[PDB]
Symmetry: D3
Subunit: 254 residues, 6 copies
């Protein structure tokens, strides 16, 4: 591999919590050169269709700064035509966060998750999910400490990683080159207890077999468990009660 990494090896991972002051939860996660600021803010309101249903909500906003993959990713602002890529990814991150939380116990308020990619070199949506969880868990713990809510209704850890087939090799966590050169690539969103929340496999003008898929899904779940072992170092949990550990940052031994 271009960087000298094994085929079943993650890039150097780093998760820093309390990155910013204002959001209830926030962090800067990085998978190699891919860097994402993930923040979680509580809005004391709910989407109209939920009003009165004794439940809370989580929704996400994703944006890539114009300096992605050392190129130009001019945001949707001073442009006009917004892309469906951003929405596909925003919908994914929202689905991951809500699966990890028992919204019944959050109350009628919304956790607004913002993922801001400040440097892109592949796996940005998987870095974003992994980081967004840390920010959501932190924000729920913060709401609890403030007395806004009774417990910390977090069901389990959530992380994500990419994997793919490149020159007939199955690689874990692809950077931008490996991915533009991939025959097949996929994103997997797994949980702390080994289950799956989401999996998308796409043949890029190449088809694949159910067995190749399984081979990739197995390699991905291993990556997901390594990222989750990192996230775990940031919390102290017991009987569904979550407290932050004393770490402000965690990184892989790589």
């Amino acid at each position: 591999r271009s960087d000298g990494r094994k085929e079943d090896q993650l890039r150097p991972v780093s998760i820093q919590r309390d990155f910013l002051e204002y959001p209830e939860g926030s962090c800067l996660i990085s998978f190699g050169k891919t860097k994402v600021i993930c923040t979680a803010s509580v809005i004391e309101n709910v989407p109209n269709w939920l009003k009165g249903k004794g439940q809370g909500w989580i929704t996400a906003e994703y944006s890539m700064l114009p300096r992605a993959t050392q190129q130009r990713t001019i945001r949707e602002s001073v442009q006009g035509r917004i892309g469906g890529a951003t929405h596909e990814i925003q919908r994914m991150i929202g689905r991951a966060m809500r699966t990890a939380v028992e919204l019944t116990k959050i109350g009628e308020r919304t956790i607004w998750v913002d993922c801001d990619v400040i440097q892109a070199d592949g796996g940005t949506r998987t870095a974003a999910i992994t980081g967004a969880f840390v920010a959501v868990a932190d924000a729920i713990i913060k709401l609890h400490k403030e007395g806004i809510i009774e417990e910390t209704p977090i069901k389990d850890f959530v992380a994500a990683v990419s994997v793919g087939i490149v020159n007939d090799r199955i690689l874990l966590d692809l950077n931008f080159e490996e991915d533009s050169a991939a025959q097949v690539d996929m994103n997997v969103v797994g949980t702390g207890s080994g289950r799956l929340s989401e999996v998308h496999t796409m043949g890029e003008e190449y088809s694949f077999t159910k067995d190749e898929l399984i081979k990739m899904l197995d390699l991905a779940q291993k990556g997901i468990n390594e990222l989750i072992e990192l996230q775990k170092k940031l919390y102290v949990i017991q009987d569904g009660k979550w407290e932050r550990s004393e770490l402000k940052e965690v990184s892989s031994t790589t």
Copy 2:
């Protein structure tokens, strides 16, 4: 099941080719009440980034009429803010069509695929892919018959189907109700020779196991093979040469 269908049973399927006159290929496919007009038009031009690269292209447009799921699906026209759902699906259909075709041999021209959902009751994007293939194959055969191209560079059949977990039951080809009530749902895009082109599994606030995924992927691939046995009745192929059979319509025995 609400309709009295088995759990591993497709709804009544129908594929009608030559639905319209003007497009090089066209058909009206239906999975139950879900109905989609799929057309394929040749534009004698290529996207700027391809110009000169001795290759052709296929891209898709998807639109849902305002009377979907017996509700209101007001198109993006007299509205303003276009959704990322449409783009996610348009990107999927394009990926499926290009995997099935050797674009090298199409020449510098584009096959513009249009999928128009005229009635929606779930599985609309999978009906669209299944129908779009018929229209693309027909359009390539038509281009050949006209002498615009030498051969009929179609690699293999492509079809798609949905499957999901509803009240802990794994069901094939979900209608709109079963899907809004699903714990997990997925779309699978397979090929004629049993391979896979795409698979997306989404936990809808529920997580799932690798084994449940496999169980679903197995049921889906069976559905894909039944839809492809139907598509097959519409062509007579030998050594990579494609001709239309004499059927103008094909339907399942259901």
Copy 3:
């Protein structure tokens, strides 16, 4: 004429009701190669400015699929700048439908008419009006049969046709060629009892006389009456009470 049609002769006309299941009324009408799916759906609500005024409403949505006139008509979706043509036509269809219905007796609900041009070869807006009426009448009859409303408040049939001056010849129902080559062209919307609902005559860089207009309006009203004789075969009316006849399709003898 290119097709061998007389100068005062309509193309082959066909109207098929019950085209789709979900809408309260629906049909597929065709004037030659021009084909339009017209559906009518009841939305149990009214536009804010009407709320409380003991009346119902009818409004229309028109869209041309990207394969019009065997060319490219990329909808307003994945584009951005919506055209005034579509709105001009949507406003026309709405005006025609409301003239034909006593909205007082529909109740505070809206009949949402959707006209989807699936193949264009001229006269598409006139085919749409002619077909939209069938779908609206059917939807009102359906609402009555369901007991949502007391009577079937339909005032009279409504149909429309184009006519024009081409190489100093006055032709009825123009296809796309004749129209792009026309010196003057017009669209006329008439009723069952011989009256007019709308007439638009446009000199296309040529001016015309009041007498030429009358000559054209006379030829148009004859076309309108032939289309209405067709629509009539689809209903059995007596003293303002409307029931569908047993025909599911009607076509001209041409």
Copy 4:
């Protein structure tokens, strides 16, 4: 009539040329309280589809200031969703201007007509057409005087007026009240020699007869001829050669 005007009587008309300095032609026309600034600017270029075809072009832009009909007409600027009304009208004005000019002899340049309604009380699109002609004629005369073009290729005068049926009375040139209260209303665009360029009659939930249409078209053509007698006082023409007369303003005796 509310203002004490006869039924076949125009409101006080006023046309002032040379309203502004910069445009090649410009004027401020007024039909009662309806006031429109019409300007005509020459852009030394042509629309891409015309390039090389030895011809010029005329296109129009229409805008209503936010203080129309003593209400609020917030332009499309700081808004977002542009209306089809504006485009319908812009297309009309363009069609009227091009019918009046032999574009062959203008050269490859464009006359950009701008109609800015600074006060609206009905008949604004007909005031705009009437005024736009004066500005176009002036701009063509100006181009000739400058030597940019050989002759003054103006075919004939063009003017427009509205008429309608209100409480079963046929009225000429409707103000905003009479028009919102009208059963049928129409706009007619006629030429200097008595011919027609455009006519649009719309039943506003009322139908009408061919005879009523003729009655209205006759009253309109009389109005068109009165407006054109005014426009005529502004030019001195002979054998197709146009010069401005010495009037800077013309008004009706009313």
Copy 5:
């Protein structure tokens, strides 16, 4: 100077009130060839965030017609992407008008100011502010005369002018040429009693000293006082009570 004007000399100024009938206040102001229609309309409502706060509001809309600086300024209508220039200026005009008025005493209604540039040759936003004040004062006087409000809560006159450094010369009120050629340029908004409401100085790729700024601010305040001496001829004020004088127009001796 190109026009033969002194360096500390305004162009010919003209302010005409009662330009239009419908708005409560209106005028046509001109600084040389720069011409702006400024109108002020009362909307019997307030912005949602003010509702109930016993106060009124003033907001402005600015638009440049397509024939600005004898070029093309195609409005935001039939375009799509609205510019930040317009908003910057609209925000400025609003700030100027609200500083001049005691909104407490206007009641819960809004004065909607519209500035329509019908000819541009520099200083258009400063002409607009100067003219908008006249229209706002007139509209408040009009509301008083109608009994809608008790007093005429106008705090003081407001006017604005531009100034700049061109080839190391400090010039007052720049036309379009002088401004595109300027090293530094600024807009100043002053009041009747000699105070300032706004000042923006921009180095156009050149920097300047605090002293040069003061030199420019001094020249500007003199220009502001001359424009205000003109505005003053249009009112008769005593103890905070405002009445219009008998002038309908005022111009400078120049």
Copy 6:
């Protein structure tokens, strides 16, 4: 002051260069809780209107993340209507950067500056300018070190700060509270040698005197010089040749 800061005292300032790897220049600057990521990327191209003019260009993009002032600042992406605030600020930052650089010597390429506010508590546009300069200087030094350009054509340092009048007190560098409570507020952009690049003073429904302006401009220029003394610690300059110093971060003693 709320934070215990003197009236003529900046908040704690921090500038960190080499914040990210990919951009040619980049930094994270902070004025208190206001934090901005400023990056500078070289695009090997120029805006069409410059092509061939032997010059380079600098343009800026500004965006505020949705968690500004501990509230909601949903970017223009998944929205639709872009604000003029962003453009006003983007235009300012561009003007500041180009004043500081001799574009003649950059070659036909563009330095694309991106300012991403990741936390807002007032003075965000002034923090952005101050930080953007560091990123631009670094990017020009980087281009030189790579041999893309001969020299380092940087004319002088550029920084900016806000100041205002709050309860009749003149305060330097306002946070969000002080600013929403200000009677007058201003932004000043100064250079390394004591000159000015830009100054905007706005009365917020209060007017001010030329003397108050000067008092504020004097306090601002002192703030600008303190920020520039910080920036200076990051470079080693001699005879127009710029090299980075060994500091990767600089902060104020506060």
